[PDB]
Design a protein around this ligand. Structure first.
Ligand code: HEM
Ligand code: HEM
Ligand SMILES: [C-]#N
Ligand SMILES: [C-]#N
Lengths: 190, 190
């Protein structure tokens, strides 16, 4: 998967497993969610193509959001979208199956650097908008979780099991976006 | 309510009703949620005291989080907690009942400035920790929504109505925390 560099990033993340422990606590994330995040990957794995179409149908339906994938002329860079889409598919499975250890944290830093001006448009060698305004990364927590929800039901899991999978996804997504704020936040304020 | 200065803030917010429109869209917030956020205020209004005890029982159960309310000696400033608790009660009702207009946005800027080093500890004239690390404001989206959820059921509303109220709260909370990132984010990166 071109540009997917999990386990081979150049930089150590500025946060460690102790930062991670304390952040999982703020998001109420426990061993029970690790079980259910894993079970969510099992339900979503088959359905990944449809999820990405839904996710991109949301993004592309709003000009101010599709904007972050556009060429300087205001039109979508179809090469950009396609390369990023493959890495997004990976992130679904990584969120479900990786031990959230130092390598995981090193890749979280990297993904944050990629939405931010520090490394946006480098991974795919594209000319696009310089920075994704952070206000939108926070905002996106909600539609990421809403998009996942009907897919988690699709395999006829009970609504309780479904609820627990969704809550795990909500926590794990909130957790990640919080780490990704690092290159956006004033030094010392994170 | 001492220090509650909604409608009398010194500064115009650096974001306007156009920024707000575009952000509500990213969080999927529509006129349907405005109806249900309002109906949520009706269900939660009676229960505010219990909600604040639950919310503070979460915060106080984790040293690294209670930390942000402590005096320099590491012990909780009970005067701080009590003053802030009254303003938090207001925010429950404001989120449910205010038109999200320029005054609302001006107060969002203010609340963000208050968690951030810019104005933390000024409103109550207390000596406490200088800044609340932003990583935790994002993280808190989740426990704010989880704390609200069982209270929204308490009045024997159907689980559908309850679901719609919760989803409105999740969206409105995500929306607010995104605005509050402003004084934390590098200029031009928001
Ligand atoms: C909940 C918040 C978000 C999640 C979970 C998410 C997920 C992801 C993932 C997994 C990647 C690929 C990472 C990799 O390189 O391995 C990516 C990249 C990207 N995303 Fe997001 N994202 C979020 C916020 C946003 C927002 C608000 C936008 C604005 C439309 C956006 C647009 C983009 C763009 C343009 C890239 C490519 C960045 C580059 O040029 O390297 N994302 N996202
Ligand atoms: C979803 C995220 C959060 C929400 C919805 C929220 C809500 C609020 C509200 C409504 C106020 C009073 C605002 C006013 O002055 O009118 C407040 C203040 C305060 N909160 Fe939060 N908050 C969040 C994140 C956090 C975090 C992560 C902490 C860390 C423990 C925290 C601790 C505090 C402190 C210390 C104050 C007083 C700040 C000052 O000295 O002015 N909050 N919060
Ligand atoms: C990112 N989507
Ligand atoms: C703030 N609690």
């Amino acid at each position: 998967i071109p540009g997917y560099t999990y386990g081979e990033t150049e930089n150590r993340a500025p946060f460690n497993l102790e930062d991670l422990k304390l952040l999982k606590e703020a998001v109420m994330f426990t061993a029970e969610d690790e079980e259910y995040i894993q079970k969510a990957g099992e339900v979503l794995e088959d359905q990944v193509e449809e999820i990405l179409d839904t996710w991109y149908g949301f993004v592309g339906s709003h000009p101010h959001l599709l904007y972050y994938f556009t060429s300087p002329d205001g039109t979508p860079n179809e090469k950009y979208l396609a390369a990023v889409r493959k890495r997004l598919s990976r992130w679904i499975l990584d969120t479900s199956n990786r031990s959230y250890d130092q390598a995981w944290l090193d890749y979280q830093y990297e993904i944050g650097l990629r939405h931010h001006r520090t490394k946006k448009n480098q991974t795919d060698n594209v000319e696009s908008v310089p920075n994704i305004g952070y206000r939108y990364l926070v905002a996106f927590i909600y539609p990421i979780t809403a998009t996942m929800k009907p897919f988690l039901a699709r395999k006829g899991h009970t609504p309780e099991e479904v609820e627990k999978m969704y809550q795990a996804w909500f926590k794990a997504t909130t957790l990640q976006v919080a780490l990704w704020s690092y290159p956006y936040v004033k030094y010392g304020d994170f």
